[PDB]
Structure 1
Amino acid sequence: SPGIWQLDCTHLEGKVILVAVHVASGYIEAEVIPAETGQETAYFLLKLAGRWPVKTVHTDNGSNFTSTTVKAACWWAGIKQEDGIPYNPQSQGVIESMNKELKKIIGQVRDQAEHLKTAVQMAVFIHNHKRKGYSAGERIVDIIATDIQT
């Protein structure tokens, strides 16, 4: 669906990269935080849902599913908070391969900035613009614009 996103948390350089993936398109937003907490996850989802029409979030683990602070942000922003269980088994693999691709890109730009957060945003840019043909950034806009026309 146009409104469905998946949370994903990966580690690099002793830091955490929190990723939101729009499942239908593969488009992503990401940020670097010192560690995953409910307050950091809640703030990231509030940012995401002010930028895209976020209807459902599959959370990345049971601590973020349970967290009262995350539940409060999902309430505030009108998001249905769901678990992230790969009922479809091809979902573990899909996230795994995105983390590996992101980390590959980060390493390809890593010497172009001191701080990891800059490299991660260069990787977000390269990921979203990569043509596979349409890019993920093209796909998400097409999907949502098609939705709005209904």
Structure 2
Amino acid sequence: SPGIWQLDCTHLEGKVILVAVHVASGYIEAEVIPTGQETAYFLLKLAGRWPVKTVHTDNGSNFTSTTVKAACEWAGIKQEFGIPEKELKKIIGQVRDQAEHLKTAVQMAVFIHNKKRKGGYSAGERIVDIIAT
């Protein structure tokens, strides 16, 4: 559906990368964070940009953050357990020597992930096509 996202944690250079995948398109947003506060904020910003209706996670961590819960309540996000990111670290590796900070290489890699084609449609075209329909 248009508003189903999967949320996960990956790691590089001792830092946490928050990764939201729009399931039907493969579209991603990611951010390097230092906590629940950061995830709540990331979710609130993602919800003002796109239709975010259900967020899937793989474990119980996000069900225990009183601050994730308030962000979800505010923005009208349902959390669901049991989801309906090596590529991401692949493209970070392709670009890492183009940027001084990890966070910059992440955003360069999101850019490439979302803009490239698999002829055909990019994840960026795909999420907009799904939301238009």
| Range class of TM-score, shorter chain | over 0.9
Question: How many angstroms does 1:64 deviate by?
Answer: 0.9
- From the two aligned structures, give the one with the greater strand fraction: 2
- Looking at structure 1, the residues matched to 101 and 51 of structure 2 have their Cα atoms a distance apart, in angstroms, of 30
Q: TM-score, normalised by structure 1?
A: 0.84
Q: Secondary structure, in 3 states, of the residue corresponding to 1:32?
A: strand
Which ranges in structure 2 are unaligned for 5 or more consecutive residues?
none
Identity %: 97
Q: Using a 3 Å threshold, how does the CA distance of structure 1 residues 60 and 43 change in structure 2: closer, same or farther?
A: farther
- Looking at structure 1, the residues matched to 20 and 95 of structure 2 have their Cα atoms a distance apart, in angstroms, of 21
Q: Secondary structure, in 3 states, of the residue corresponding to 2:39?
A: helix
Aligned CA-pair RMSD: 1.2
Which ranges in structure 1 are unaligned for 5 or more consecutive residues?
86-98
Deviation by residue 1:84-141 (Cα, 9 ceiling, x = unmatched): 35xxxxxxxxxxxxx2111111011101111000000000000001101100001000
Preserved contact between residue 65 and residue 82 of structure 1 (Cα < 8 Å):
no
- Looking at structure 2, the residues matched to 115 and 15 of structure 1 have their Cα atoms a distance apart, in angstroms, of 11
Pairs aligned (count): 131
Preserved contact between residue 10 and residue 17 of structure 1 (Cα < 8 Å):
yes
Deviation by residue 1:41-77 (Cα, 9 ceiling, x = unmatched): 1111001001001011113431112211111000001
Moved over 4 A (4+): none
Question: How many angstroms does 1:6 deviate by?
Answer: 0.4
Report the counterpart of residue 6 of structure 2 in structure 1.
Answer: 6
Q: Secondary structure, in 3 states, of the residue corresponding to 1:53?
A: coil
Is 1:20 the counterpart of 2:20 in the alignment? yes
Preserved contact between residue 6 and residue 84 of structure 1 (Cα < 8 Å):
no
